[PDB]
Paper text:
The adherence of UPEC to the urothelial surface is mediated through the mannose-specific lectin FimH, the natural ligand of which is the mannosylated glycoprotein uroplakin Ia present on urothelial cells. Mannose-based FimH antagonists compete with this interaction and prevent bacterial adhesion and hence infection. Here, the first crystal structures of C-glycosidically linked α-d-mannopyranosides in complex with the FimH adhesin of uropathogenic E. coli J96 are reported. Two ligands are decorated with a para-biphenyl group on a C-linkage to an ethene spacer (CcbP) or to an ethene with a branched methyl spacer (CtbP) and one with a naphthyl group on a C-linkage to an ethyl spacer (CN).
In order to solve a complete structure of the FimH–CcbP complex, trigonal crystals of native FimH were soaked in ligand solution. In this case, two monomers were present in the asymmetric unit. As for CtbP, the sugar part of the CcbP molecule is located in the same hydrophilic pocket as that observed previously. Nevertheless, because of the new cis configuration of the 2Z ethene moiety, the biphenyl mannoside is now bound in the open tyrosine gate (Tyr48 side chain χ1 = −58.5°, χ2 = −89.2°). Furthermore, in one of the two monomers the terminal biphenyl group can interact with the lipophilic amino acid Pro26 and is thus presenting an orientation that is well defined by the electron density. CtbP (trans) and CcbP (cis) can accommodate both open and closed conformations of the tyrosine gate formed by Tyr48 and Tyr137. We found that the linker-associated water molecule is shifted away from the C-glycosidic linkages compared with the O- and N-glycosidic linkages and that another water molecule could come in to assist in hydrogen bonding downstream of the C-glycosidic bond.
Numbering used by the authors: 1 to 158
Write the structure that this text describes.
Amino acid sequence: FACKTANGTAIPIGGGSANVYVNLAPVVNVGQNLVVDLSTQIFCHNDYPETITDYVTLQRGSAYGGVLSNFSGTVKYSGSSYPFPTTSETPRVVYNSRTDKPWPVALYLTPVSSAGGVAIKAGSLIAVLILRQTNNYNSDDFQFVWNIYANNDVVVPT
Ligand SMILES: OC[C@H]1O[C@H](C/C=C\c2ccc(-c3ccccc3)cc2)[C@@H](O)[C@@H](O)[C@@H]1O
Ligand code: NI
């Protein structure tokens, strides 16, 4: 089991960490959502699907910087929604193919009223998403850690 991002770093077999940059709507109001869909960026595959089934969970979702102080959130994982920051590890998604398949994670972030001005800084860390992979074959239990960085400023009026 291994993961990569669209253009492009990878995390090899056995886990590790990578940094991911995301484009954000540059203006969001109180009551509107920022959607950060990571499923178009993080792709995973099973290296031996004929004998092994890989199980993948969102172990933990944590907020940082601007998002942590100026936004409230949920995360959508494989159809289901959860508070973001997360309060527990999710159910699992099966990976049973050598073909790259998206990691189906999306954040929905909404400004709290105390946000005004630049509520997320360009280049700043906004979130960490930990992917936990196990299988039905041996005791492999690995974390793939995605550090999420803002590409651009996000302003909340006025
Ligand atoms: O993505 C599937 C598996 O890929 C790798 C497997 C690591 C060692 C391994 C490799 C091949 C075989 C194997 C089994 C049957 C036939 C041929 C090879 C068994 C273990 C590891 O990432 C496992 O964690 C993961 O479950
Ligand atoms: Ni591979």
